[PDB]
């Protein structure tokens, strides 16, 4: 039996397991309230095994007004109050940047360095904490049009990249937000009865940003003769997607670009440096070219490449992806994945990227992340208003004072309810790891 | 040395192609079968060892409801389906709404006592509620014209790429429990092998289930009220049951048709899997859209491994969804129960139906059953009885009524005869398909 | 152990990436080749053993038809294509409509005395009729901007993920039969191996065919008339031929461009596959949309293994369709003939052209040939000749005509010089590409 | 100065007035809760004057579940809780037929009959209690796409037909609904310093329904040769749009058709009988032909005719209109406006119509309306479900009891708030007429 479905025609003596946000009270809070300024373990899994599937969704609301909804009862209703502020009954505002303030962190085989350290959004192909609806073979986002075109929009994420581990999987959320946020997850794996071959390649992901890129000509018009006649062979100043020591293969990237001059951000060539070569052996032709579009980026999202968020729908930013699944970029010792930031590094745009690759352990490269203050989208902000109240009527002052009093009483009651859910999250964290161990030992006893 | 999902294209295989098709064995342009009312028909039997690689089908079921000025004998040899609007006054072949539920597809492997596939024709091909939706996924597709979409029994092209291996025999049948015949076009592609498949090859299985109503404890309570949300359900004994099967194998997903009655949300219930007879489920989900890898309700998205076929927002309160577990199958050594709470802790009493898909080693230990036809029809609202009283008729109106009734009495029997002729062709080509498959098998084995 | 279509990501391979690209080897921003008029150019030669894993290209072909106020020497170093509306009065680089048909892609493996791929540039990349459509499938994609869609020669991005293994040699050329040069951007990715591929590795092949007109017996009879439908065709001697090849391998699909003349339906014709010299087809289809896994005509769907690239409802009577047999290949030990009746029983006399894709062990037994350029052009209606007479001119109108003609006399030769320089760059970079691929092969093999 | 704008260039010594649902507490409830099973006077105006413009919108919710929103505070928030029932916090369901259960009733010069007596929806070109978004010269509906496609959808209605009156205008809502409903209105007029000419034509509107139409061949296929060769000259059995004695002109209609056989409802000809003639002097060709469409109805709404709700978008029903503003159908003694219900009255469909006309007083015969039971849309109904509860856990029974307890407490609290808002409507009804009288008398004193 041949072809991409053939393994369905053969049984495998492997045991399914799942880390999930399931309500371990048996009730309908099948999510975790991830605490502010804390890391939480979604679970630890003893290998040998393989992550086969991840699904998540999330919400981060800030309470900004008093509500006439009873906050104790409200805590047990639906998790997110999707109610328009115009109704005057509640105001749970959208937190715009929570997708960049939270990280997903994965450590294999009890290494002293993570193999995945990426902003929560970026890892699931939400760039700029601004989701786009799209499908590809390994990553998908299902975003409602009602929610689309907003920073911090709720959406469903799914990852089908396999993540093998011979000894240990530790999956954490690091929440650098001053706000807690709601996380639903289903993380599916299988456990094996024998070790994986020792040269099994493990899933890695890292995140980078150059903001600004150090361009030599950001004020020169893109594609002017002067710009286009500048030379760049060795790519020393190229944007660096990935720079890693070891044996394995690059499987692709997402790239978020905020373009400032309003011409074109994408004349820059991909250039790959394999096993320490001085000049790149793989030379590309342009950035949309690298993403397999042409004459700019199109509103297409195909199995191995395309657009997640189109520049034409936004205030000058693009989110793009390419997967190298059947055409990976292999290396024995070292790989540097670069892209010129504009032709010959002309431009000074805001570039950020997730690199995904597989490699044999140990992970020699110590993966780092920019601090939270360096991960936030660049957005224009309104000037200072400095409003001066008119002379208030006694009625108007009483309205203000009554409202303020409702706010003084209400906010603490919402705070109490967030603290109860955060206590559930920490409790279910250790329960998830305990159940995963029980399942491991029961499977091995066999 | 070649790697990745295209790699088997770079190596030759000493296997012989065959195809069961509705091709016109007169050599003419009726490349379809008129499946008779209330009969089973064998699409074909193939001797193993082999593997089904691809199925394509399309179908039509019209009821003659008015006389036509189209000569019915010549009309039989024109295009098979009269796509003519009734407002033209020249013909009326009405759409049969529920034919996708009235017909079953049935597949038996290795001359077993029980079928391994027994599913309504529509549901098997990811048509839920006998109501097609246009979509693509990796193993199943439906191609539905926008002019036909949004109605029960709409014509559309269905395709299945799930491989179906068989060491000894494949028998593919249509069980037509409809009072009406229907038109079936098919191409079923397969390859034949010169050596047996390995001993614990996993065989393709599919089974259909419905709970209508689900036995909810709180169907009149508002979904997501605090009272509903604080009820506990750990053990899932009253969960909706997608699949309950003894064997060694793996679940590869489902479609799920839900008609939701209260106008809130049907989908808070968790998927819960019970592997190898465990009392509590080892795999705990978070919600029904969550299981379908959507969030905050279902979206109008159809992706390679999950999504929406028919969105609730486009219908009279019903949703058709799917998930494929192709790279993330749910394995079992001895037993699998795939459940979903029907609303949080089985609160709701909606109309749930599902197709379950799985592979397992033979034998098929579980006798696969189907609900009878009267339990497979969509729940639809009906107009109040009319009981119209005729006005006083003129001579001219009574003569128009008489002339028309006379034309109808002459015309319906002439159409009936043309159905019966096409049914004879289907019964004949059924036998011819198997006989050719056998000749092809024997010639391959000789060579 | 790891299973499913992603499994090969979880093991390392000791294989070395390479890439043939139109990268500016001056290190500047002309990362494209100006392919000369009436010339062949080698994109590169690679020494095996290795495998092509990915191709991306885009292109542009404009005809300078008016003088420009843009400095033509400086213009050469700006963006490569002046996407400037003719109504502005400042430049006019007109679209060349048929350049996708006037150029070929030509691939030779292991220094054979025939190419294994010889297909028009467009059709190879699933641009039928020199008229792009936006679509995705598993092996081939076109990303076409809406602003460009719905015209002949529209620019678009093409990509190919079919693997192309080779033990000894890969030589990739463009044959430009156009009177005009064209711009080609390309990234051709491959890997090199440290030992030979198995002897019987199947190599990628592609051939192109056109029957214009098809030799129909009743082009003037209405499609699906009782007279047409009762004609028999078993043996399919007169069927449209997609592929006719001697060897050991498997067909993996096609694209099919049909221009239909009578305004009914072109697709009643059945696929008929003749395996290993059999006189009667063993694989019998039901219809042409049925082969493409649509039904009741073609839909505006493009799914992973089949569908519509350009829909007849969006054009002046032409359709471009595809089907991939990746999990369901049609295998042959000695010979394969892939045919489709051109209308039922070869009734119709439409314009049919096709790309066939197959893999086979070497040798390529027969030369792959192609119809000459005059036989590859789309069939388009033509305006009556408008023999304009000028009115009596004012001195001012004559001076404007004179001034314009003089600008044009000065301007055109300056653009010609700029094309000749870029053509010289393409010929220089052709040789550099091959030299670098040889250095990389040798350094890889050294360790 | 010529053309349709020419009157903007001449001053007129006329005084503006407006009847409105404005909050006469000075607060932000600028609507009336129209009580169930009651008539309420929007206002009475002393003539001479002319209505120039009407704007309304409305809402009718049924409380069907208990809410965690404090119901007393909720009464002073936004007037309509546009909150999805899936959130679990409130359930104010849409009342589907309120547009047909309430009438608009207008009486001129204290006549012993109204001159307008039409269901609230149909008057404002909402057919079948089912809004559709459209514009025309005298009537508009502005309907949000998120509300569209359902019975009882909220939308804004506007009327620009002038309504002159020499002595008196009385404008009422007759609410035959068992539920109250929210009405916002702005009714603009001018008052004049002298009588209008006594031959001034007054605005009339009347509603009719034939359900079923009394067809001779409802089971025969439409456009069958048998149907098409039946004759109808005199049109005795035609659907009647208008049948009135006096001197005036018909200015058009809306027509709601629910079609049963699934072919074409519209082969019937318009046939007008002017001044008592036995045979119609104006012979039409078909129903879509009368609506100035062809080959069925189109999704077009033009200044003088078209589609409000397209059969292609619904469960078998169409709403259409035609205005005869520049091409009115005049009569000296009598007008009968008829349409064959199918060719030669073949069909037995559900037809209802609003007829609009102007005439010199008196209104000869009382304008009557079918009672509420005869005004409801024909809708298919689900089979009786007859659910049986399973054996309940103690926890499930306590859940049901707690919810019932919340409901028993909550519903009467909402009832109380409806009753207070109804008192406001009745109070402002009287204040509207008193202020209109003070305005009349102040203008007249000037
Ligand atoms: Ca470049
Ligand atoms: Ca749940
Ligand atoms: Ca045929
Ligand atoms: Ca007529």
Author numbering:
A (entry chain C), D (entry chain B): 4 to 449
B (entry chain F), C (entry chain A): 3 to 449
The article reads:
Here, we identified the BBDE_2040 gene product from Bifidobacterium dentium (α-D-fructofuranosidase and difructose dianhydride I synthase/hydrolase from Bifidobacterium dentium [αFFase1]) as an enzyme with α-D-fructofuranosidase and α-D-arabinofuranosidase activities and an anomer-retaining manner. αFFase1 did not catalyze any reactions when DFA III or inulin was used as a substrate, and there were no significant peak changes in the reaction of caramelized sugars other than those of the four peaks. These results indicate that αFFase1 specifically catalyzes the reversible hydrolysis of the intramolecular α-(2→1′)-D-fructofuranosidic bond of DFA I and DHL II. Because of the significant bias of equilibrium toward DFA synthesis, we propose a common name difructose dianhydride I synthase/hydrolase for this enzyme (EC 3.2.1.134). Each monomer consists of β-jelly roll 1 (residues 3–200, green), β-jelly roll 2 (201–396, magenta), and a 51-amino acid–long α-helix at the C terminus (397–448, blue), englobing the whole structure.
The ligand-free structure was determined at 1.96 Å resolution. The hexameric structure corresponded to the possible biological assembly that was implied by size-exclusion chromatography and the PISA server. The six chains in the asymmetric unit have virtually identical structures, as the average RMSD and their SD for the Cα atoms between all chain pairs are 0.15 ± 0.03 Å (maximum = 0.19 Å in 15 pairs). A Dali structural similarity search of the whole monomer showed that αFFase1 is similar to the hypothetical protein BACUNI_00161, which is used as a template for molecular replacement. Several capsid proteins of phages showed weak structural similarities (Z score >8). The metal ion in the crystal structure was assigned as Ca2+ based on the analysis using the CheckMyMetal server. Treatment with excess amount of EDTA did not inhibit the activity of αFFase1.
